[PDB]
Design an enzyme around this catalytic site. Structure first.
Site, PDB file in Angstrom:
ATOM      1  N   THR A 112       0.837  -1.160   0.000  1.00  0.00           N
ATOM      2  CA  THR A 112       0.000   0.000   0.000  1.00  0.00           C
ATOM      3  C   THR A 112       0.912   1.264   0.000  1.00  0.00           C
ATOM      4  O   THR A 112       1.325   1.835   1.015  1.00  0.00           O
ATOM      5  CB  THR A 112      -1.110   0.023   1.048  1.00  0.00           C
ATOM      6  N   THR A 113       1.192   1.732  -1.226  1.00  0.00           N
ATOM      7  CA  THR A 113       1.942   2.957  -1.537  1.00  0.00           C
ATOM      8  C   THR A 113       1.157   4.135  -1.044  1.00  0.00           C
ATOM      9  O   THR A 113      -0.104   4.096  -0.934  1.00  0.00           O
ATOM     10  CB  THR A 113       2.325   3.078  -3.006  1.00  0.00           C
ATOM     11  N   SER A 117      -0.535   3.307   4.796  1.00  0.00           N
ATOM     12  CA  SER A 117       0.839   3.593   5.190  1.00  0.00           C
ATOM     13  C   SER A 117       0.966   5.159   5.464  1.00  0.00           C
ATOM     14  O   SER A 117       2.023   5.683   5.275  1.00  0.00           O
ATOM     15  CB  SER A 117       1.880   3.259   4.114  1.00  0.00           C
TER      16      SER A 117
END
Lengths: 59, 234, 91, 246, 245, 219, 249, 238, 202
Positions: free
Chosen positions: I1-2, I132
């Protein structure tokens, strides 16, 4: 002769004496001594009639 | 909100093996565009009148020669909207066959299925059946085939038939004339000559449109090519 | 660019024409054929007014070498427009 | 033409005639003639131009749907020609179908495919008399991605094919032959000329002419494939040039 | 206008040979008999004025209404056959409410004007329903797109408007809106201007006395369609009598 | 069974896989084609369970055919993207089809990778299955910036050689599939480096374990 | 309007019966004839195609007789158009019953079920009843060899030799005259079938292109439904020459 | 004829002939007067009977103990709208729990009765309802027609020559709000006689009384339980 | 999860995001888009997981498509973000995805809206989100000041994306940043092929 067939997209037999009468109507104004190709082609153009095939109708 | 209007039968049986309102539809295809189809016996070639008689025609994909699939093409005579639905339906049918068989729909089969909707529209109130007749080509069984599906939904089997202006007269000339064992190039030349006999006026390459079906697959001939065939024959 | 309807453009052309013949002799002859062309378009009143203009070109051109040309233009016009024109004008 | 004979209950129903005519469709042509809208369409290689008249009953208007130029998708644009009521309903149907295409196709739709979807839908109208066909006429203009600029015209029925140049409205046939001479004379296709040739034709057939504010021109240029309305300024640029052009 | 009572309106799916249904032409004729309802778009809102018929001194606000809030920010002023106008308000109320659930913002009138005009055309198409017998205006003030005024006829045309009036004399009232510049006005000055036009245009042949009821969706009602505030109402009322004289 | 990889010269796709079709984890067929043709210029490399890959590819195969024939304009990868997207999202998981879709679309060249879920993203080289990594490692060596069609062929034969060694279910031939605007090559053999063959010796027992007693011949 | 017409489709007429049902029988009269005959070890269908044309390609070799199932066969008497829809309904019913039953589909059972759909339309739905009478031939164990006849009126009939389509009154008598109850075997019956078709047509001259002949003969463990190729029918057309003499004698 | 039975043929005034017939249906039906106060709402309706050996049919119908309706016209057409009004009010009470305003409820009824006027081949209903309700604002008498058109009145009377009843009502309009439950009935009685000939006044067994409020629960007075509310009337005010 | 981020200028937005779309433990594609076709005029900033974003992104394309034509070409930011709320409403805790929506509607000025994975839609200053963003929360906040100006936004936004891929164990090579105006959506690539590192620990 070839051109006379080309110009209208609809014409019938009865309509040939009518377009001849129409060409002759325009031609008398000019006051000529001969009947030009010019007179016939305008004569076809006015009351050429609807393109019935594309919309619906015949087709 | 809701619609009613017309839901009682509009179609009454005539003693002739056909209903009145369908008989009238067959006159509609006759006043339709000239389309000729001849089975060359090493492919089928189908030719249609490109024009709708405005004589401004600029075709690159807007054709009335349409590939449905790999080896099926359709050319028609009659109504435009009625035809577009048959083309959309045909791909769905061909593919329906393609999923199960891993080959698309034979000529016979495609005809049975298109024919059932055309009749549907007759018997039902508040609808009218198509005004379209199809020249359907295909390569199945190891032989080229050509079928005629009429606006009624009836089918007549033909190796060569003509539609459009002077269709009746068109069928008798083909019935006598029809050829087989024809090279690909010859197939085009015969097809164009037959088109000359149905269709009146000028032919150049934005007046007539030709498509061929053979072993390699159905494709639609480029406007340059059609011209070369047209010139060639008497 | 367009016809602009026969009546609309015609009123304008007709007024300038009448003035052109009157004022001057030589520069008039070159301006008058060009103004004369524009008025030709109708089959309406414009024919009557065009014809007077023609007489002027004919005498002025005779003075010049344009004499051969001058006859052709008037001669054809009398044929073209027999008109509603008056007798003084017709003789 | 024919008004048909009945043998069914053909008279108020779309079902066949001995001409092959559908009654409701023929009535759909008379709907064009009610609106007063006539369009001249020209295809080039620089652009596809649609130019059509804008209706003014009064000078208190907002232009957002007075407009007969519609965005049927961001690249490809169109006009509805004919009666404005029938036009709005059709535009509405088409846009929901267009958006459906967006979910399926995932991108900007070819002009050939866009006209084909509207054509199938209008097949539903044409076969029914349950719901009368919409007596508007659509000319789609736009640049098909590899082929170039295209002008296609659908009838109320839905008959579509390609043309060098097309016309729709009060009378198709008279407008077409005027346009045919413009097509024969085939001008150098650049931006100024294709717009100008379209504009000259629509003015000659009416013999009323107009100012740029009175017409709406919509182009799809190779310059920006977006469907763009010129507006009062940009059309004016052509008009002043056109006057100097013979 | 074309229509004959025999032929080509004996089903609500029958298309007339002239290109415009007889039934839609009949629907417009009813609007033409009714009283004048006006709605003028301002720079800071929209001001409505519709005359509320009083046949008895027994009547309250509920009797003979012609101001609806389709949303609660969008208004609807109708003229013509009241019976179809109130039913189309109810379906429209639902259509707005569903939009607000999904979309979640003050609805842009430009989208409403297309969806409603198509719905009004749908009823001309279909046999189970007949065309709507009123012409109505939709008017809103929002921050999403500002002041918006649209009118839909019973044909099922939507056009955009600066200021429209519908009544017994549609053309005289619209020339009168043309003379004045709303560009110079703010929403406060407009209330005066709507009020006079309603009194002059309307010809008594069916009234006996009417009450003018007006509604704001403007500055002193904050982008929700409320009945006119008291100060504004009194400014508006005096000018209307003064204009007669 | 299906491990697929693709490489980009700077054009569109040469998609590579080693052949073998399996009935579960037992070979049905030694090596027959499993990088597939859809109607006539779209090809799909596959990974994961091969099965979902085939049926999704086939519906999409229907829908792109509708757009090609009217337009006469390249097969639309985005169309094919969307249909798969739509099917997999409703349930939130319905089969696993890991697909390398690749066709040059009417406008830009468009390459898609559809996983088990939905996606809407647009990369340009993807290698699929749990052995995506094995295929990627040949490309990362061989291909620095820019590559050619022949060069792209040489990486592709190499990606297919790696999967054959990594999982024995993939075996034998390296199939190379050229997918373009209008050139679509399917030719089984592109490299014979192994082959599954029949014995040169023969032993089988005739009548010393055979038992018969009745015969008839129905049609 | 719609309220000022008559067609008396769902509405009963002065007759006590609907116009639409009676009219369908007239359309059937001038369309190609279908007959089914009984043999001792099979049943057969012989039909005249709706094509009077002199040139057929044989794209579909079922243009009158369609084999539904490996246990059944049908003919069409009437319009080919209403047949197309009916043919598709028949391929499903015939196979569905078989999935369950595991026994060759009873000729009677099939027709009564079908006849119910034919009557459903005329009574309700505002649709006309199909312009096609379908002649079903099949075999089940508990009646034996069968022929059943289907109408647009929802009438069914258990027959041993009957003909429907064009000039039906003549045709049923002609099948009775040559062929009594249980008389004629399968091969000799195929000849008889062509002989009546030659006489009765919408348009004369009987050829391979105009006829399609189908056999139900029970083979070794399976009941085999075949439509005969043009080549085989031709051998029967010469057999039909021989048969004319034989009926008389 | 058959162009007057078509619900798709209209006058040049833009009035459908079928809606016009449907309003008159009310008018041939018996006269009912409906009044409001600021504590109560009273429905006074005129009865009928078939025989002397019979009791008269309540024209006051029971919906809820806070809202009540009175009919004038066709009973069978009435009963379909009645099944609709009971369904909506009870809904409101379960879900919202507000003792439903009259004003919201009539507008939805207006939508439904409008549907047959648009339908081809379907007749409009032709019964008139004076719906009496009590919500927390106070009582309202709304009158809904066989068309959408609904009225918010202090007092209204509908039926034969109903215009004349309105005149008595208008003279005592203010008084209604001050008056009591008992008086509101007596002022109703005095309006109801104006509709009928001056040759005749009311009697005990042709009067039905329906009382509404939430200071009281709904009551229907029939033919002999009418008497206490009845006393105090003036014979034909002209 | 960028990570996904959109930082506020005051007339246009700048977004910045890191790349890697992942097939579980293994990263499947790091040559992907982070601003694919969502409409034709609109941008959303995407990361997270491929499926969580995709279902929402398409429904908004289809609704947006109706909105844009009827209104006249530009849609409303607030309308667009609500459509995404619906997908999330069903899949409440199922999808962790949260989409960062940034636009210029005809509503008025610049607006940055945060559509949550719960079903929440809000217009705010600047938020950066992901699964994130409980990780780069400090780093955005220091950059984020009242009216952070555009030239400043290019360095700040890119850096936040850089900080993410280096630190991230769900990050990956190349930050692909997206700047949105009323002209369409524009992506730029700031390399990390070439050596860029958020300075090592001892």
């Amino acid at each position: 002769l070839e051109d006379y067939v080309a110009r209208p997209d609809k014409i019938s037999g009865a309509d040939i004496n009518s377009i001849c009468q129409e060409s002759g109507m325009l031609a008398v104004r000019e006051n000529r001594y001969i009947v030009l190709a010019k007179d016939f082609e305008k004569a076809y153009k006015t009351v050429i009639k609807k393109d019935e095939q594309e919309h619906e109708f015949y087709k | 909100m809701a619609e009613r209007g017309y839901s009682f039968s509009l179609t009454t049986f005539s003693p002739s093996g056909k209903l009145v309102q369908i008989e009238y539809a067959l006159a509609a295809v006759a006043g339709g565009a000239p389309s000729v189809g001849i089975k060359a016996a090493n492919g089928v070639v189908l030719a249609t009148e490109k024009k709708q008689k405005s004589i401004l025609y600029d075709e690159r994909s807007v054709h009335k020669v349409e590939p449905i699939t790999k080896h099926i093409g359709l050319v028609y005579s009659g109504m435009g909207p009625d035809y577009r639905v048959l083309v959309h339906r045909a791909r769905k049918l061909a593919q329906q066959y393609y999923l199960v068989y891993q080959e698309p729909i034979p000529t016979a089969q495609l005809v049975q299925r298109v024919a059932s909707v055309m009749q549907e529209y007759t018997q039902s109130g508040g609808v009218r059946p198509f005004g379209v007749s199809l020249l359907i080509c295909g390569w199945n069984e190891g032989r080229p085939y050509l079928f005629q599906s009429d606006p009624s939904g009836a089918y007549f089997a033909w190796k060569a038939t003509a539609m459009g202006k002077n269709y009746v007269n068109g069928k008798t000339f083909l019935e006598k004339r029809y050829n087989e064992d024809l090279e690909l190039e010859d197939a085009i030349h015969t097809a164009i000559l037959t088109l000359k006999e149905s269709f009146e006026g000028q032919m150049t390459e934005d007046n007539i449109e030709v498509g061929i079906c053979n072993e390699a697959g159905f494709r639609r001939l480029t406007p340059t090519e059609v011209r070369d065939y047209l010139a060639a024959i008497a | 660019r367009r016809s602009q309807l026969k009546q609309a453009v015609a009123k304008m052309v007709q007024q300038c024409c009448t003035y052109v013949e009157e004022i001057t002799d030589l520069p008039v002859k070159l301006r008058l054929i060009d103004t004369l062309r524009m008025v030709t378009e109708g089959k309406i009143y414009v024919e009557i007014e065009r014809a007077r203009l023609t007489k002027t070109l004919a005498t002025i051109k005779e003075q010049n070498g344009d004499v051969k040309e001058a006859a052709s233009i008037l001669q054809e016009l009398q044929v073209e427009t027999y008109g509603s024109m008056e007798k003084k004008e017709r003789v | 033409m024919s008004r048909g004979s009945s043998a069914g209950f053909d008279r108020h129903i779309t079902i066949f005639s001995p001409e092959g005519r559908l009654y409701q469709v023929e009535y759909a042509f008379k709907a064009i003639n009610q609106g007063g809208l006539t369009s001249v369409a020209v295809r080039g290689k620089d652009c596809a131009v649609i130019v059509t008249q804008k209706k003014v009953p009064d000078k208190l208007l907002d232009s957002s749907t007075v407009t007969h130029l519609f965005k049927i998708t961001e690249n490809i644009g169109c006009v509805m020609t004919g009666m404005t009521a029938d036009s709005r309903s059709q535009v509405q149907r088409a846009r929901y179908e267009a958006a459906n295409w967006k979910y399926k196709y995932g991108y900007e739709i070819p002009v050939d495919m866009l006209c084909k979807r509207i054509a199938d839908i209008s097949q539903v109208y044409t076969q029914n008399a349950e719901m009368r066909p919409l007596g508007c006429c659509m000319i789609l203009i736009g640049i098909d991605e590899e082929q170039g600029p295209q002008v296609y015209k659908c009838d109320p029925a839905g008959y579509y094919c390609g043309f060098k140049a097309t016309a729709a409205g009060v009378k198709q046939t008279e407008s077409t032959s005027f346009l045919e001479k413009k097509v024969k004379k085939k001008f150098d296709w650049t931006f100024e000329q294709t717009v100008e040739t379209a504009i000259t034709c629509l003015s000659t057939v009416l013999s009323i002419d107009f100012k740029p504010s009175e017409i709406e021109v919509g182009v799809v240029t190779v310059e920006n494939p977006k469907f763009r309305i010129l507006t009062e300024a940009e059309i004016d640029a052509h008009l002043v040039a056109l006057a100097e052009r013979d | 206008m074309s229509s004959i009572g025999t032929g080509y309106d004996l089903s609500a799916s029958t298309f007339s040979p002239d290109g415009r249904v007889f039934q839609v032409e009949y629907a417009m004729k009813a609007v033409e008999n009714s009283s004048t309802a006006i709605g003028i778009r301002c720079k800071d809102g929209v001001v409505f004025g519709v005359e509320k018929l009083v046949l008895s001194k027994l009547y309250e606000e509920g009797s003979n209404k012609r101001l609806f809030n389709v949303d609660r920010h969008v208004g609807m002023a109708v003229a013509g056959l009241l019976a179809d106008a109130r039913s189309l308000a109810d379906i429209a109320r639902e259509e707005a409410s569903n939009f607000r659930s999904n979309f979640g913002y003050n609805i842009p009138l430009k989208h409403l004007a297309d969806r409603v005009a198509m719905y009004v055309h749908a009823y001309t198409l279909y046999s189970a329903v007949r065309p709507f017998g009123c012409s109505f205006m939709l008017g809103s003030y929002s921050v999403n797109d500002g002041a918006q005024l649209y009118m839909i006829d019973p044909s099922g045309v939507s056009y955009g408007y600066w200021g429209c009036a519908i009544g017994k004399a549609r053309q005289a009232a619209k020339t009168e809106i043309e003379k004045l510049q709303m560009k110079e006005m703010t929403c406060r000055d407009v209330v005066k201007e709507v009020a006079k036009i309603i009194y002059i245009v309307h010809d008594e042949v069916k009234d006996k006395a009417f009450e003018l009821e007006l509604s704001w969706v403007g500055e002193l009602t904050k982008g929700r369609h409320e009945i006119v505030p008291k100060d504004v109402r009194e400014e508006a009322e005096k000018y209307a009598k003064e204009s007669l004289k | 069974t299906t491990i697929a990889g693709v490489v980009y010269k700077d054009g569109i796709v040469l998609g590579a896989d080693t052949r073998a079709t399996e009935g579960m984890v037992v070979a049905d067929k030694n090596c027959s084609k499993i990088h597939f043709i859809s109607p006539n210029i779209y090809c799909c490399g596959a990974g994961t369970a091969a099965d979902t890959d085939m049926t999704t590819q086939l519906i999409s195969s229907n829908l792109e055919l509708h757009s090609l024939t009217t337009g006469r304009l390249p097969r639309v990868v985005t169309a094919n993207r969307m249909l798969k997207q739509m099917l997999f999202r409703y349930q939130g998981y319905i089969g696993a089809a890991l697909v390398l879709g690749g066709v040059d679309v009417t406008g830009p060249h468009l390459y898609s990778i559809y996983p088990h879920g939905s996606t809407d993203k647009l990369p340009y080289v993807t290698m699929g299955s749990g052995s995506l990594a094995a295929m990627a490692v040949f490309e990362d060596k061989f291909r620095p910036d820019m590559e050619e069609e022949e060069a792209k062929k040489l990486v592709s034969e190499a990606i297919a050689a790696g999967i054959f060694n990594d999982l024995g279910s993939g075996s034998n031939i390296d199939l190379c599939v050229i997918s373009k605007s209008k050139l679509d090559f399917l030719r089984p053999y592109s490299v014979p480096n192994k082959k599954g063959t029949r014995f040169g010796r023969y032993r089988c027992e005739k009548g010393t374990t055979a038992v018969l007693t009745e015969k008839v011949t129905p049609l | 309007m719609s309220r000022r017409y008559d067609s008396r489709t769902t509405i009963f007429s002065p007759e006590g019966r609907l116009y639409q049902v009676e009219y369908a029988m007239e359309a059937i009269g001038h369309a190609g004839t279908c007959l089914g005959i009984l043999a001792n070890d099979g049943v057969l269908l012989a039909a005249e195609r709706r094509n009077i044309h002199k040139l057929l390609d044989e794209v579909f070799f079922s243009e009158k007789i369609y084999k539904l199932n490996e246990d059944m066969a049908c003919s069409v008497a009437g319009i080919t158009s209403d047949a197309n829809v009916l043919t598709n309904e028949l391929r499903l019913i015939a196979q569905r019953y078989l999935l369950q039953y595991q026994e060759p589909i009873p000729c009677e059972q099939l027709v009564t079920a079908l006849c119910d759909i034919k009557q459903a339309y005329t009574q309700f739905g505002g649709k006309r009843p199909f312009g096609v009478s379908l002649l079903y031939i099949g075999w089940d164990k508990h009646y034996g060899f069968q022929l059943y006849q289907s109408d647009p009126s929802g009438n069914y009939g258990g027959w041993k030799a009957t003909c429907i389509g064009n000039n039906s009154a003549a045709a049923v008598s002609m099948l009775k005259q040559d062929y009594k109850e249980g008389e004629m075997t399968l091969k000799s019956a195929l000849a008889l079938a062509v002989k009546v078709l030659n006489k009765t047509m919408d348009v004369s001259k009987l050829s391979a292109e105009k006829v399609e002949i189908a056999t139900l003969t029970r083979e070794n463990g399976k009941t085999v439904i075949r439509v005969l190729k043009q080549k085989e029918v031709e051998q029967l057309i010469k057999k039909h020459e021989e048969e004319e003499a034989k009926a008389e004698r | 004829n058959q162009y007057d039975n078509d619900v798709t043929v209209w006058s040049p005034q833009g009035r459908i002939h079928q809606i016009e017939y449907a309003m008159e249906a009310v008018k041939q039906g018996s006269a009912t007067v409906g009044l409001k106060s600021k504590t109560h709402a009273v429905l006074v309706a005129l009865k009928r009977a078939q025989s002397e050996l019979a009791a008269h049919q309540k024209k006051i119908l029971h919906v809820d103990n806070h809202i009540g309706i009175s009919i004038a016209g066709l009973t069978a057409d009435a009963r379909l709208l009645c099944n609709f009004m009971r369904q909506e009010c009870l809904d409101s009470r379960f879900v919202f729990d507000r003792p439903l305003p009259v004003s919201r409820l009539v507008s939805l009824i207006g939508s439904k009765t409008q549907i047959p006027t648009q339908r081809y081949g379907r007749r409009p209903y032709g019964v008139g309802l004076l719906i009496a309700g009590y919500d927390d604002m106070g009582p309202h008498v709304f009158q809904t027609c066989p068309s959408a058109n609904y009225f918010d009145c202090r007092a209204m009377s509908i039926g034969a020559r109903s215009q004349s009843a309105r005149t008595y009502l208008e003279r005592h309009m203010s008084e209604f709000m001050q008056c009591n439950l008992d008086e509101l009935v007596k002022h109703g009685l005095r309006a109801l006689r104006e509709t009928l000939p001056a040759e005749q006044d009311l009697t005990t067994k042709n009067v039905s009384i329906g009382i509404v409020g939430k200071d009281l629960e709904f009551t229907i007075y029939d033919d002999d339980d009418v008497s206490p509310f009845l006393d105090g009337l003036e014979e034909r005010p002209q | 999860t960028t990570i996904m981020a959109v930082q506020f200028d005051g007339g246009v937005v700048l977004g910045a995001d890191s790349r890697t779309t992942t097939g579980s433990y293994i990263a499947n594609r790091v040559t992907d888009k982070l601003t694919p076709i969502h409409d034709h005029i609109f941008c959303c900033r995407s990361g997270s997981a491929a499926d969580t974003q995709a279902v929402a992104d398409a429904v908004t394309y289809q609704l947006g498509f109706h909105s844009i034509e009827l209104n006249e070409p530009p849609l409303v930011h607030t309308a667009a973000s609500l459509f995404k709320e619906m997908c999330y409403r069903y899949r409440e805790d199922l999808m962790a995805g949260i989409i960062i929506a940034g636009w210029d509607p005809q509503e008025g000025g610049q607006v940055y809206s945060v559509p949550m994975g719960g079903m929440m839609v809000r217009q705010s200053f600047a938020i950066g989100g992901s699964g994130s963003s409980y990780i780069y929360g400090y780093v955005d906040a220091t950059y984020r000041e009242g009216m952070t100006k555009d030239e400043c936004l290019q360095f700040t936004a890119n850096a936040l994306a850089l900080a993410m891929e280096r630190d991230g164990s769900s990050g990956g090579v190349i930050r692909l940043a997206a700047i949105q105006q009323s002209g369409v959506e524009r992506q730029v690539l700031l390399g990390d092929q070439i050596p860029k590192v958020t300075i090592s620990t001892l």
